Amino acid sequence: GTSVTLQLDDGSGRTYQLREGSNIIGRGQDAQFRLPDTGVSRRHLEIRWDGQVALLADLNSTNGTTVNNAPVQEWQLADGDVIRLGHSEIIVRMHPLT
């Protein structure tokens, strides 16, 4: 099994571990990973995780999403990908379980 972590690269080191299903990143209180960034939409992107594959989708955000500085709608994440949204940067890492 695999797990995926998202780490904010703002100095705080704040981290979120993907759960199975939908994982919403945004500025709003319904977000699973909530960012204090006015350039980030209330529900900005989703990462869908099934324990194997992490699929990122921009949720029609106002400012868009990039991965590895490429503009994305949907994107299949890999270890080391860097997600940018608003003024924020998130480093994606995979690690094995058990």
From Swiss-Prot:
Post-translational modifications = Phosphorylated by PknB.
- Please state where this protein is localized: Cytoplasm
Q: Where is the FHA domain?
A: 23-72
Q: What is the effect of changing Q29A?
A: Does not affect affinity for MviN
Known partners and oligomeric status:
Interacts with (phosphorylated) MviN and (phosphorylated) PknB via the FHA domain. Binds to the PknB juxtamembrane domain with an affinity that is modulated by the degree and the pattern of phosphorylation of this juxtamembrane domain.
Q: What the record says about its domains?
A: The structure of the N-terminal domain remains unchanged upon phosphorylation.
Function text: Regulates cell growth and peptidoglycan synthesis by binding to MviN. May inhibit the late stages of peptidoglycan synthesis.
What name is this protein filed under?
FHA domain-containing protein FhaA
Can you name the source organism? Mycobacterium tuberculosis (strain ATCC 25618 / H37Rv)
